[PDB]
Design a protein around this ligand. Structure first.
Ligand SMILES: [Cl-]
Ligand SMILES: [Mg+2]
Ligand SMILES: [Mg+2]
Ligand code: NA
Ligand code: NA
Ligand code: NA
Ligand code: NA
Ligand code: NA
Ligand code: NA
Ligand SMILES: [Zn+2]
Lengths: 67, 476, 475
């Protein structure tokens, strides 16, 4: 199984449905993208990610110096 | 009149007034909870809150459009469900002046939010029916949430304890991501913590008194405690708070449905978003903070108070309509009594219209300067229009008149580069920084030269009586 | 050292070698002005000069009371050689004691009530009036603390305001006051003139130097200046007494002269011209007239007047710190990131602000607050903002911040048609000037900055090498 947003295989199960076998939830762990086993997600080409975009992504808020 | 101690009391009133409907059928969370929220706001007027009793995978329930109408907004203040907009603005304007109303601290046994405690394997999904709000959202989000943090430098100063609203992306069973925007109070405390590489203790509350959620989103000063404002808006009745379990200096509402006690991991950012925001567009993914949940307290059968947001005038736009204008009006009026009213209902205050008397020439620009040096307006307000005392800033028809007859773009329009901005504004090309525009739609006052005649016409003599004589003649 | 009247302060000035006596008789016209200009021209340690005999008059005069840092320090009860920044920090502290209710005394206990003039009124009998600058329109009363009360709320002691305004003598019993539109007195005058009713007024002369100090201080409308005097006296309340003719009007108990009267409503006459602090004559305009109804004064009154003109006269010393401190406090209330504010130059028309930049563009927000403050909205034309570590009082460093941190493409902002000050001779539409904000701060996110602007950490041993060099030089 691969991630729908960045295509990495470092994806794992996050949680099971608290009641029965309704569904599961998976997480990328390379880009934090999570999704439910029921909803088949199709990430728009605008919102996909690679190692390059995550590198120069910009932080909110800035990290201060250490003193 | 009616004051609420928990979200449940308010929901009962909403149902008694026909402003809440129950979705008794089970419904899977993905496309539906969002759709019902959009449809509820799309109803136009008298929009009710929708209560989902059963969700496909989860144990508990959710409610979506709690704040999503003027009717609910009026009932929140204890007013008649049909109280007008201008009536509510005046009621807030009055109660606001009771500001310091010390909250009432209660014993832990008396707080419903402490009924249940989770300390072993932590799982948000066990207690919160998490769902996806918009299709391309990066994950499951907690939009309506009141977050409590304390100043690391002065942890005993109750005034520097701040509660505000921030969007939270669930990233694991026990970890979430918070948007600590640079211009909000929480970032001030986060910087103090990260400057020493120390975590920042935090408490995330869900399902509160509608006034608490209201004050959370209100841009009051840093040294002003929002719980003390709740007591004022309750017309002097103090609200009930209890001390957090893991962190003193941290106080949460006693009647919260869920409380998440944890800490912000310092000097760490991960991929948060994307997320559909109030301007009606997706906000791009950025590197934002993560918080680790250390313990969960919640009421039996907890209720998930979440909201839908998107193309404007969703639930969030009603929430922000008056809580943004009132403190901006009060903040300006403190320095400049000539200010009459402030309208900041549009796009969360990115557009502000101010009505004021012009004490002396150019005073309108000075008012705009004050608005642009206020906690909220400095980073948020991009377009500031100033009109005369007699123009209703909430009547866009009149504002359109002031623009066409009182604005000389040679002098009355001023554009300032490289000023503080808000990144959620999808127009800012240097993101989080926008060029301000000030429009002085006031009539010139000395010593500003005015070769033209701009005084308004006094109505003819009998206009007052003729209105009655015409109305009387029409009754035939 | 706390003073209850002008005489106690003058005694201290003489004990410290900061007051000289002109025992010889001297003509009032060319001399009192020349002595005032010469006194400030001394450069440093400028003393106050006390004239014992004036050609036509009975009593005496004092000029350049506030006209030096030495006198300014003795005013605060500090050592005569206390530094500028030391005094600035001392004011920053006493300021936070703000509400210090003054002490009301019985009429018999007030020295200013020793003599009363009720019959034919003549200012020249008691005040050695003289002309300050050659082309002045007449004899002027520069240093004077004027007391007025709000007609709408005459009982609210907070809305009682005392400030300094220039006064041209136009007859034995009538004078002209410059009620500038941006000052507090104009707010009260408009309320009175809107009903064609006179505005009660009390003109005091020769006061505690702290009273003269607070008069010229741009505090808020709802703040009483007498309560600030108690704060600057480190908690010692000052003494006030009720005016004879008008209740709601309180004057200092130790004043040399008190002129009780009223502003004639809806009337303007030819006032000026008058040489002002920018070093130029201010043109003649139609300004208010005041009718003197009664005079109370101490026996052997002393006329505390000042000379002003090409800058750094006595007035420039008076306004140096009383303008910077309230601007710093007013800014600091909303924005804790502000470090210090320098507004000593030409009465605050130029202001330099030192601040931390919370987030990108915050420097412009600080400038916005300064331009929306009681004194900076109409006065401040050029606002330079520098980093936390730049001393806004060290123009050398400010010049460094300008040359290395200012990109005129973005950092310079010019805004047309903003509130202005008519006394600034540059305003083309007079009383209305275009503001200029200069962001000499280092860029902070989210403002993009591709360049390296961080400052160099000094080499390792610089601390010790400073000592080793000083020791080697002692040979
Ligand atoms: Cl015309
Ligand atoms: Mg706050
Ligand atoms: Mg005043
Ligand atoms: Na808030
Ligand atoms: Na606070
Ligand atoms: Na205009
Ligand atoms: Na006052
Ligand atoms: Na004053
Ligand atoms: Na800069
Ligand atoms: Zn991924």
């Amino acid at each position: 199984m691969k991630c729908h947003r960045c295509g990495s295989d470092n994806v794992r199960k996050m949680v099971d449905s608290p009641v029965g076998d309704a569904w599961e939830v998976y997480v990328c762990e390379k880009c934090c993208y999570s999704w439910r086993s029921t909803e088949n997600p199709v990430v728009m080409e605008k919102f996909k990610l690679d190692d390059n975009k995550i590198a120069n992504m910009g932080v909110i808020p800035p990290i201060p110096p250490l003193k | 009149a009616k004051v609420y101690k928990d979200l449940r009391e308010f929901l009962e009133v909403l149902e008694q007034e026909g402003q809440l409907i129950r979705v008794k059928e089970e419904v899977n969370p993905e496309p539906d909870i969002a759709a019902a929220g959009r449809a509820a706001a799309n109803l136009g007027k008298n929009q009710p809150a929708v209560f989902f009793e059963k969700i496909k995978g989860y144990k508990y329930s959710v409610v979506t459009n709690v704040h999503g109408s003027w009717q609910n907004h009026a009932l929140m203040l204890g007013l008649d469900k049909n109280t007008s907009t201008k009536d509510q603005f005046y009621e807030l304007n009055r109660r606001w002046d009771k500001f310091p109303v010390p909250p009432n601290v209660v014993k832990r046994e008396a707080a419903p939010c402490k009924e249940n405690v989770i300390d072993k394997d932590i799982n948000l999904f066990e207690i919160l029916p998490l769902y996806r709000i918009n299709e391309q959202d990066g994950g499951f989000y907690i939009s309506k949430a009141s977050v409590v943090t304390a100043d690391p430098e002065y942890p005993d100063d109750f005034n520097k304890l701040n509660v505000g609203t921030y969007r939270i992306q669930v990233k694991d069973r026990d970890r979430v991501g918070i948007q600590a925007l640079a211009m909000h109070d929480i970032a001030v405390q986060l910087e103090k913590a990260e400057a020493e590489n120390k975590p920042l203790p935090i408490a995330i509350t869900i399902g509160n008194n509608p006034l608490v959620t209201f004050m959370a989103s209100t841009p009051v000063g840093y040294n002003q405690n929002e719980y003390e404002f709740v007591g004022a808006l309750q017309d002097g009745v103090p609200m009930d708070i209890v001390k957090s379990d893991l962190y003193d200096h941290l106080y949460v509402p006693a009647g919260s449905e869920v409380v998440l006690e944890g800490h912000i991991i310092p000097r760490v950012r991960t991929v948060e978003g994307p997320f559909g925001e109030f301007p009606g567009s997706y906000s791009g993914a950025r590197l934002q903070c993560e918080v680790k949940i250390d313990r969960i307290t919640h009421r039996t059968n907890p209720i998930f108070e979440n909201l839908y947001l998107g193309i404007p005038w969703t639930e969030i736009d009603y929430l922000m309509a008056l809580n943004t204008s009132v403190p901006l009006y009060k903040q300006l009026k403190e320095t400049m009594p000539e200010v009459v009213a402030v309208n900041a209902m549009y796009t969360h205050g990115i557009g502000v219209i101010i009505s004021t008397k012009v004490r002396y020439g150019g005073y309108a620009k000075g008012v705009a300067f004050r608005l642009l040096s206020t906690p909220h307006g400095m980073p948020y307000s991009k377009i500031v229009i100033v009109v005369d005392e007699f123009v209703d800033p909430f009547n866009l028809e009149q504002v359109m008149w002031a623009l066409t007859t009182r604005v000389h773009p040679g002098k009355d329009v001023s554009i300032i580069e490289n000023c503080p901005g808000m990144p959620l504004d999808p127009s800012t090309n240097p993101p989080g920084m926008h060029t301000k525009m000030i429009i002085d739609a006031t009539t010139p006052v000395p010593p500003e030269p005015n070769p033209r005649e701009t005084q308004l016409l006094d109505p003819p003599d009998g206009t007052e009586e003729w209105e009655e004589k015409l109305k009387e003649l029409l009754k035939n």
